Design a protein around this nucleic acid. Structure first.
Ligand SMILES: Nc1nc2c(ncn2[C@@H]2O[C@H](COP(=O)(O)O)[C@@H](O)[C@H]2O)c(=O)[nH]1
Ligand SMILES: Nc1nc2c(ncn2[C@@H]2O[C@H](COP(=O)(O)O)[C@@H](O)[C@H]2O)c(=O)[nH]1
Ligand SMILES: [Mg+2]
Ligand SMILES: [Mg+2]
Ligand SMILES: [Mg+2]
Ligand SMILES: [Mg+2]
Ligand SMILES: [Mg+2]
Ligand SMILES: [Mg+2]
Ligand SMILES: [Mg+2]
Ligand SMILES: [Mg+2]
Ligand SMILES: [Mg+2]
Ligand SMILES: [Mg+2]
Ligand SMILES: [Mg+2]
Ligand SMILES: [Mg+2]
Ligand SMILES: [Mg+2]
Ligand SMILES: [Mg+2]
Ligand SMILES: [Mg+2]
Ligand SMILES: [Mg+2]
Ligand SMILES: [Mg+2]
Ligand SMILES: [Mg+2]
Ligand SMILES: [Mg+2]
Ligand SMILES: [Mg+2]
Ligand SMILES: [Mg+2]
Ligand SMILES: [Mg+2]
Ligand SMILES: [Mg+2]
Ligand SMILES: [Mg+2]
Ligand SMILES: [Mg+2]
Ligand SMILES: [Mg+2]
Ligand SMILES: [Mg+2]
Ligand SMILES: [Mg+2]
Ligand SMILES: [Mg+2]
Ligand SMILES: [Mg+2]
Ligand SMILES: [Mg+2]
Ligand SMILES: [Mg+2]
Ligand SMILES: [Mg+2]
Ligand SMILES: [Mg+2]
Ligand SMILES: [Mg+2]
Ligand SMILES: [Mg+2]
Ligand SMILES: [Mg+2]
Ligand SMILES: [Mg+2]
Ligand SMILES: [Mg+2]
Ligand SMILES: [Mg+2]
Ligand SMILES: [Mg+2]
Ligand SMILES: [Mg+2]
Ligand SMILES: [Mg+2]
Ligand SMILES: [Mg+2]
Ligand SMILES: [Mg+2]
Ligand SMILES: [Mg+2]
Ligand SMILES: [Mg+2]
Ligand SMILES: [Mg+2]
Ligand SMILES: [Mg+2]
Ligand SMILES: [Mg+2]
Ligand SMILES: [Mg+2]
Ligand SMILES: [Mg+2]
Ligand SMILES: [Mg+2]
Ligand SMILES: [Mg+2]
Ligand SMILES: [Mg+2]
Ligand SMILES: [Mg+2]
Ligand SMILES: [Mg+2]
Ligand SMILES: [Mg+2]
Ligand SMILES: [Mg+2]
Ligand SMILES: [Mg+2]
Ligand SMILES: [Mg+2]
Ligand SMILES: [Mg+2]
Ligand SMILES: [Mg+2]
Ligand SMILES: [Mg+2]
Ligand SMILES: [Mg+2]
Ligand SMILES: [Mg+2]
Ligand SMILES: [Mg+2]
Ligand SMILES: [Mg+2]
Ligand SMILES: [Mg+2]
Ligand SMILES: [Mg+2]
Ligand SMILES: [Mg+2]
Ligand SMILES: [Mg+2]
Ligand SMILES: [Mg+2]
Ligand SMILES: [Mg+2]
Ligand SMILES: [Mg+2]
Ligand SMILES: [Mg+2]
Ligand SMILES: [Mg+2]
Ligand SMILES: [Mg+2]
Ligand SMILES: [Mg+2]
Ligand SMILES: [Mg+2]
Ligand SMILES: [Mg+2]
Ligand SMILES: [Mg+2]
Ligand SMILES: [Mg+2]
Ligand SMILES: [Mg+2]
Ligand SMILES: [Mg+2]
Ligand SMILES: [Mg+2]
Ligand SMILES: [Mg+2]
Ligand SMILES: [Mg+2]
Ligand SMILES: [Mg+2]
Ligand SMILES: [Mg+2]
Ligand SMILES: [Mg+2]
Ligand SMILES: [Mg+2]
Ligand SMILES: [Mg+2]
Ligand SMILES: [Mg+2]
Ligand SMILES: [Mg+2]
Ligand SMILES: [Mg+2]
Ligand SMILES: [Mg+2]
Ligand SMILES: [Mg+2]
Ligand SMILES: [Mg+2]
Ligand SMILES: [Mg+2]
Ligand SMILES: [Mg+2]
Ligand SMILES: [Mg+2]
Ligand SMILES: [Mg+2]
Ligand SMILES: [Mg+2]
Ligand SMILES: [Mg+2]
Ligand SMILES: [Mg+2]
Ligand SMILES: [Mg+2]
Ligand SMILES: [Mg+2]
Ligand SMILES: [Mg+2]
Ligand SMILES: [Mg+2]
Ligand SMILES: [Mg+2]
Ligand SMILES: [Mg+2]
Ligand SMILES: [Mg+2]
Ligand SMILES: [Mg+2]
Ligand SMILES: [Mg+2]
Ligand SMILES: [Mg+2]
Ligand SMILES: [Mg+2]
Ligand SMILES: [Mg+2]
Ligand SMILES: [Mg+2]
Ligand SMILES: [Mg+2]
Ligand SMILES: [Mg+2]
Ligand SMILES: [Mg+2]
Ligand SMILES: [Mg+2]
Ligand SMILES: [Mg+2]
Ligand SMILES: [Mg+2]
Ligand SMILES: [Mg+2]
Ligand SMILES: [Mg+2]
Ligand SMILES: [Mg+2]
Ligand SMILES: [Mg+2]
Ligand SMILES: [Mg+2]
Ligand SMILES: [Mg+2]
Ligand SMILES: [Mg+2]
Ligand SMILES: [Mg+2]
Ligand SMILES: [Mg+2]
Ligand SMILES: [Mg+2]
Ligand SMILES: [Mg+2]
Ligand SMILES: [Mg+2]
Ligand SMILES: [Mg+2]
Ligand SMILES: [Mg+2]
Ligand SMILES: [Mg+2]
Lengths: 196, 38, 94
RNA sequence: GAUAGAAAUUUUUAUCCUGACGCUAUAGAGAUAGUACCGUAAGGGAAAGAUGAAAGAAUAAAAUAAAAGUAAAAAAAAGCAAAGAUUACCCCUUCUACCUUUUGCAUAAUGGUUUAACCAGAAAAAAUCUAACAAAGAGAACUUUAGCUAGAUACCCCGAAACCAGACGAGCUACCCAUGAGCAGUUUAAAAGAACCAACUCAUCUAUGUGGCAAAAUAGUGAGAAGACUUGUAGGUAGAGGUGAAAAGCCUAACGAGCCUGGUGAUAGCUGGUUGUCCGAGAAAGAAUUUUAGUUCAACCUUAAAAAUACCCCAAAAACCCUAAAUUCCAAUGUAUUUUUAAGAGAUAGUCUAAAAAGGUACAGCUUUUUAGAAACGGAUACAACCUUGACUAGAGAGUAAAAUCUUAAUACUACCAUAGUAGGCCUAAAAGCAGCCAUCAAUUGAGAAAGCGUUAAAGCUCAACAAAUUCACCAACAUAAUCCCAAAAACUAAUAACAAACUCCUAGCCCAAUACCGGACUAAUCUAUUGAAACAUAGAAGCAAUAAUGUUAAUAUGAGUAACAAGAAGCCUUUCUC
RNA sequence: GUUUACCAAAAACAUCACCUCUAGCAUUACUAGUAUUAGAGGCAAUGCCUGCCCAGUGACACCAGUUUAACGGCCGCGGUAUUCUGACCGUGCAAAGGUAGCAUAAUCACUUGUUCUCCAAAUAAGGACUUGUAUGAAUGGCCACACGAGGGUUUUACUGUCUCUUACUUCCAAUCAGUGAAAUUAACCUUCCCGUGAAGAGGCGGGAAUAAAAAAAUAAGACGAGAAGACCCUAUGGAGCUUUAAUU
RNA sequence: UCGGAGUACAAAAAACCCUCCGAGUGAUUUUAAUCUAGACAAACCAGUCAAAAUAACCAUAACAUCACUUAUUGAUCCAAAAUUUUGAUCAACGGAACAAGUUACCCUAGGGAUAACAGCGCAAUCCUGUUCUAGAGUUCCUAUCGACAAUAGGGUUUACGACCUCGAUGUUGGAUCAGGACACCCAAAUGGUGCAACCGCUAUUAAAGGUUCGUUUGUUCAACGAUUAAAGUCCUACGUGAUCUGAGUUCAGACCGGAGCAAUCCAGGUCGGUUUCUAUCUAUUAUAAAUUUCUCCCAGUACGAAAGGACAAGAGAAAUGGGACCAACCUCACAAACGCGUCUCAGAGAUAAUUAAUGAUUUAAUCUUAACCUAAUUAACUCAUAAUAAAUCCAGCCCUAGAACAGGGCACA
């Protein structure tokens, strides 16, 4: 059974109460963000740019390690983090790194934070698959938010527009969201196969 | 009711079919074939 | 097994009934008769100017006869015999 | 607006002469009777009689033995049950039950088991016909520029949910008021809106039952069981209300608001039904409309009457950038039709085919306009619309019409040898005819610095070239569905054959189909006035005709002798045994 | 404890408790009572609480003003987080701009949100995250004992529920004897296949089949019986209910 | 509601929720009268022209003009003016003087004139094939695909239409039983491979027989666990409720989120919620002549550098299905029935796709819609073969025979 008839209405007979091109662009942006995260962070091995996005609590806010520290390579299998600008947030940086799922165990040396490269092992690959699943779930949440915004716009326009028109646009947006989440699942499966 | 121009050859009336059958082209036929005639 | 969709003779897909040699011969005979008719209808005995008013008194007389026949419409005469013949229903033997 | 509607002023002579063109037991009063019966009550409300002078003539006598239903007498392939027939019941051939509603019904759309009896068109303003008298008519009141008076011609039945008024209902149930009564045993200093569990009160779940034991039950299993408990008797609250631990619950088996009576023959643009024969003509939609489920006009059509032109219509004529089929108006001609006058109704919810278009998918048995056609008892096997066919009766005559197996199922191209400048020049690891770019000359009688395979590059295999013979050689072929394929079969005895209609001739005639609506002539059965007197005629009247309303009443069939129903045993006969 | 007697016994109603309003009083209710009282209501014992708002509509006030344990409400826009912020920084409008708590709920959709436990396997169940842009505090919010023929999920035990049914009795059933209905019924002399047809044929067309009658079974069809479809639409047809409908 | 252009090509008219423009009036002065022939148009109501004659201006015009000039507008009644006029997004524009929402508590009269299920038409969508080769495939279109395009077919999904049913054609899913198609998942016979072998990828032929058990979900689907030779796609009123269930949907009760002031509602969720029928007719109520897996040998053989590793042939065992039967085990308080237990299960022809032998058209070759005999070859299907197959005694009584009727016995004893 076919069970799902794809609809592409025009986007052009509407053009005004919803922008299907804009919605598709937002969903493509979500997909691109997921792919960029997969490429930058979880390649096979942690790099100074991979842990530059770990948020650290500072002044009741969220800031990145790259923003509040200087991350570089000292040894081929070592990462050196200099929190000279913000020595207060050293413990918060350790917390961010340690409960980060990237399997980085840092050593506190006052301010010269020392992160060894653990290894590439079966356990490391399993944790990387777990991180890939977590990031796919976060991207799915972002896609759900994007779809909810379009539904809210339709609700705003739902006082003078025909009920059939609103239903058709809702079906189209749901179809786009389903296609994008299927693409997200495919990318996650490909990345999992690559890691394992 | 079909349009005047269609894609399915738009089958004709029986009278028109008979008219075309009657008016089919009849090529001339010589009394004796000339291939291996002198 | 070989169904004909819809009705046999009205739909987009009809029954492919062909044309027979008898039908062709009948049409050819009708065409020959019509060709003879249109040959006989080619050369008139009189021309348009010669026929102008050649039989007009007869048409006027026919119309006048029709008018007179229509104008003669009127109720019929009532006679004493018609009224007095109803008493004959009680004629007996003395 | 629908409709309502006087008055001032006029006319009206006592009594008998009164009975019936009213019914005859489904009629006439409901009536044998307001009785049986049905409801608590108000209230509703029937059916049922047939001998004879004598039954103090029942060893009783005569008329019909005519409805449906049975028996006498069950049936023998096959088919809307019949018709054509036939020596012969079937066997042969042909016909898609009837009303109603629809564009269209065998439709598997509605209605009906059958019989009998009842059951449904009603009005005279304007008009038509006939008659009296007529510038006047009418037996009083009015109308009159041929009119007035009289007579005859006309307009149905059943059905709601509802609304209002007044009665009757709290013996069921909802809640109160009086008066009484029940709760045994066990655990607890307890009679604790405690616990177990009886009587008792409810009714969670399941299975039977579903015209049942029962218009709410049986079996098992459940909850409460000293309380906001169950229950007897009696009283109260009554419908624009009562009562409600709000379920819009309950208020006498149907409560979003009881039942009965009256208004009431409520009203339905909605459905169903609407009863004798024959004949004449006969209609598919433009505009308004709380209107598109309907009406009122127009256009068509019917019935009468006046007239005179009516359709077909050659020229000529009808716009400007281009424009088809063809239109409008017109003499002649072939026919007889048309227009006005007076009465009028139905219809105004449509199907396909051919053509010009539009929307859609250059889709529909799709939707909307314009032109034409059809709605056979023949043909296309069956069939609405396609084709043939100016529709009467009888014949055991004939001639014709449309129409009865459609076209191909097709594509072969074979020997013969191929050497030379030279690996042409550049690029490239290599580029030798062939990743690539440029030149494309030349040796031989004849062979392209090479048209395809092949090598990393070479090699090697072919094509064109000569020499040898040389039938013909350009494109064209294309799977499938679901219960079981679908007349059988046939390539040559002469064919512009033959057979084939509601067509057309022939012999006679009573001398041409039909739905809604319209017109006409007859007519079954009753009563009356006159005839008649082995059952009728002329007139006048209507309770004036039923194959159809899930019609009413009564009787009958089918289902069906089916579902279902019942009495412990023996015995000495009501005495002993088993539960 | 109560409820839709006759398809719903419930999470619905009531309930002790806590809060609001209305009343200073006499011979038939309230009541032969007198504000520690009596009526009109909300929410539901208890424990912690019940946050902000009188802008509008009500009610007192007959105008101001007061009242939300009265009806009710408790933000929008720009930017920053790789996309995705309810967080923050500004800005504008407001009567205030959702406090505590709980949280993928019995809570629009997304949705089978993510993760862990349970199982060999779970869209089930439980715990945690939660951002519920439509949760939320007497139209009450959170936990807790006891209770529940309430709705879901586990563990042993038990078994014909099941693998996979079997044997035997009673009532049924079949025959004999008696009595004897109901829905239903145009008439049937009441086949199958393909095709056609008001578009699903016993009755039409082309073919097959075909001595006639009983008795017992099964239910595929007779668009089977039952109830002038309760779903949908129409009706210048009703009725119940609510009002910011029109006359009052 | 009114007008213009196209549809509607040339007298008039002519529709669509057909394609486009517009109007609900402004500016200016020439402030544009009365009466009456004859006409256009038209259902009616309304709308339009207009000769002659009249009083005032040139003593020679008066139709007010322009903005596409065409539309710029409203009937009676009734209200107001000073008797002459005026008054409506009465715009639902032939107009009721003034009136909303909701009903799932609903009712009545109808409609298949009109929707939800099914059927039917079409094939937009879906699904199958072929034609065409640019491109991937190292070179190489077609081993496997194959864009832009062409053409033919099927009627599984959604939609479209509204033709049969609303004086009823009862719905998803599941249980039982399945009939059929082939567009074959397995089993069988082959062609090509970028086929060394094992695994594979495609295509041809074949429909007699099969196509599992479980967790979650009402689920069809879907995910997951364990297997299998495989766990096929569909049609059958999305087969089958006068055979069954009612978990979901879709009645009356009630919460939650939201909308509405409310009644009430949500293509939202959750709990609960009556599934009748005694069969009249048609139809039907048992003959067979097997299938598939697994183990061992082949064999560590062929094939492969090695890792890996068959086929064919030969032996057995098991399961399913068909038909039967109680010696034992088991259910078993009847001597029987019964499974959980035991027994049996087959030869020939025939073919489709595809291989080769001989050999003309075309003195070569060539499996031949060329004859002659040819052989290797699927599943069906028929037939060998198997079963029944002695007519006219039937009162009664037994029976491993049976509803009744039937059928077997009644001499050993
Ligand atoms: N409106 C209209 N209905 C017609 C016409 N002819 C027949 N009918 C209707 O068609 C039905 C009968 O069909 P017919 O017998 O004419 O084929 C009846 O309902 C009848 O009223 C007509 O010309 N106009
Ligand atoms: N304005 C107006 N009202 C009319 C007319 N004819 C009748 N009416 C009625 O008269 C009434 C006038 O009331 P008003 O509207 O002046 O209070 C309304 O009911 C209106 O419908 C008319 O021609 N014009
Ligand atoms: Mg047409
Ligand atoms: Mg058909
Ligand atoms: Mg057709
Ligand atoms: Mg009026
Ligand atoms: Mg009587
Ligand atoms: Mg009789
Ligand atoms: Mg016969
Ligand atoms: Mg017919
Ligand atoms: Mg009609
Ligand atoms: Mg119809
Ligand atoms: Mg039918
Ligand atoms: Mg029908
Ligand atoms: Mg009907
Ligand atoms: Mg019928
Ligand atoms: Mg009828
Ligand atoms: Mg009937
Ligand atoms: Mg008169
Ligand atoms: Mg009234
Ligand atoms: Mg009482
Ligand atoms: Mg009482
Ligand atoms: Mg006690
Ligand atoms: Mg107690
Ligand atoms: Mg009981
Ligand atoms: Mg029991
Ligand atoms: Mg009990
Ligand atoms: Mg108890
Ligand atoms: Mg208890
Ligand atoms: Mg009322
Ligand atoms: Mg009340
Ligand atoms: Mg309630
Ligand atoms: Mg309610
Ligand atoms: Mg009652
Ligand atoms: Mg009536
Ligand atoms: Mg109507
Ligand atoms: Mg006639
Ligand atoms: Mg008329
Ligand atoms: Mg002319
Ligand atoms: Mg003329
Ligand atoms: Mg009409
Ligand atoms: Mg049509
Ligand atoms: Mg026509
Ligand atoms: Mg006609
Ligand atoms: Mg015929
Ligand atoms: Mg004729
Ligand atoms: Mg040379
Ligand atoms: Mg050569
Ligand atoms: Mg194929
Ligand atoms: Mg003849
Ligand atoms: Mg004739
Ligand atoms: Mg008489
Ligand atoms: Mg009568
Ligand atoms: Mg009768
Ligand atoms: Mg009936
Ligand atoms: Mg009758
Ligand atoms: Mg009987
Ligand atoms: Mg009996
Ligand atoms: Mg019976
Ligand atoms: Mg019985
Ligand atoms: Mg007894
Ligand atoms: Mg309780
Ligand atoms: Mg109570
Ligand atoms: Mg009760
Ligand atoms: Mg109940
Ligand atoms: Mg209870
Ligand atoms: Mg109950
Ligand atoms: Mg409560
Ligand atoms: Mg307190
Ligand atoms: Mg509450
Ligand atoms: Mg509380
Ligand atoms: Mg508060
Ligand atoms: Mg206030
Ligand atoms: Mg204030
Ligand atoms: Mg609210
Ligand atoms: Mg951002
Ligand atoms: Mg929490
Ligand atoms: Mg939700
Ligand atoms: Mg479970
Ligand atoms: Mg969310
Ligand atoms: Mg809220
Ligand atoms: Mg709330
Ligand atoms: Mg509140
Ligand atoms: Mg419990
Ligand atoms: Mg309970
Ligand atoms: Mg047993
Ligand atoms: Mg009946
Ligand atoms: Mg028969
Ligand atoms: Mg058929
Ligand atoms: Mg036949
Ligand atoms: Mg037949
Ligand atoms: Mg045959
Ligand atoms: Mg049946
Ligand atoms: Mg029938
Ligand atoms: Mg049925
Ligand atoms: Mg029925
Ligand atoms: Mg009805
Ligand atoms: Mg219904
Ligand atoms: Mg309804
Ligand atoms: Mg109307
Ligand atoms: Mg009324
Ligand atoms: Mg008001
Ligand atoms: Mg005219
Ligand atoms: Mg003049
Ligand atoms: Mg209107
Ligand atoms: Mg109008
Ligand atoms: Mg008009
Ligand atoms: Mg409800
Ligand atoms: Mg009804
Ligand atoms: Mg119609
Ligand atoms: Mg559907
Ligand atoms: Mg169906
Ligand atoms: Mg349909
Ligand atoms: Mg059907
Ligand atoms: Mg279509
Ligand atoms: Mg097709
Ligand atoms: Mg390539
Ligand atoms: Mg189908
Ligand atoms: Mg229809
Ligand atoms: Mg139509
Ligand atoms: Mg229906
Ligand atoms: Mg019926
Ligand atoms: Mg099967
Ligand atoms: Mg095949
Ligand atoms: Mg295979
Ligand atoms: Mg099979
Ligand atoms: Mg379907
Ligand atoms: Mg089904
Ligand atoms: Mg059935
Ligand atoms: Mg079912
Ligand atoms: Mg049943
Ligand atoms: Mg349910
Ligand atoms: Mg439920
Ligand atoms: Mg329950
Ligand atoms: Mg039977
Ligand atoms: Mg039965
Ligand atoms: Mg082997
Ligand atoms: Mg066996
Ligand atoms: Mg040879
Ligand atoms: Mg060879
Ligand atoms: Mg045999
Ligand atoms: Mg015997």
């Amino acid at each position: 059974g076919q069970s799902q008839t794809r609809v592409n209405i025009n986007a052009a007979l509407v053009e005004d109460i919803i922008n299907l091109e804009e919605v598709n662009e937002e969903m493509k942006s979500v997909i691109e963000a997921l792919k960029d995260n997969f490429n930058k962070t979880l390649n096979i091995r942690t790099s100074p740019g991979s842990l530059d996005k770990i948020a650290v609590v500072t002044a009741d806010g969220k800031l990145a390690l790259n923003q509040i520290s200087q991350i570089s390579m000292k040894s081929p299998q070592l990462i050196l983090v200099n929190m000279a600008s913000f020595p207060e947030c050293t413990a918060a940086a350790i917390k961010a790194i340690r409960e980060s799922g990237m399997n980085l165990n840092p050593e506190v040396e006052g301010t010269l934070i020392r992160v060894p490269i653990p290894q590439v092992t079966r356990e490391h690959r399993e944790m990387l698959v777990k991180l890939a699943k977590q990031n796919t779930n976060k991207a799915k949440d972002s896609l759900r938010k994007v779809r909810t915004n379009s539904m809210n716009k339709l609700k705003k326009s739902k006082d003078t527009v025909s009920e059939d028109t609103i239903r058709l646009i809702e079906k189209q947006i749901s179809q786009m969201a389903d296609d994008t989440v299927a693409e997200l699942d495919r990318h996650l499966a490909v990345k999992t196969k690559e890691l394992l | 009711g079909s349009k005047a121009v269609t894609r399915h050859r738009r089958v004709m009336h029986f009278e028109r079919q008979k008219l075309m059958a009657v008016t089919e082209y009849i090529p001339p036929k010589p009394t004796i074939n000339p291939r291996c005639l002198p | 097994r070989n169904r004909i969709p819809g009705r046999q003779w009205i739909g987009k897909h009809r029954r492919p009934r062909p044309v027979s040699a008898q039908a062709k011969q009948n049409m050819i005979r009708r065409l020959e008769t019509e060709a003879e008719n249109q040959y006989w209808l080619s050369r008139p005995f009189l021309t348009a100017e010669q026929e102008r008013g050649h039989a007009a008194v007869r048409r006027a007389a026919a119309f006048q006869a029709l008018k007179a026949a229509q104008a003669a419409r009127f109720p019929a005469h009532r006679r004493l015999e018609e009224q007095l013949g109803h008493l004959l229903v009680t004629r007996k033997w003395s």
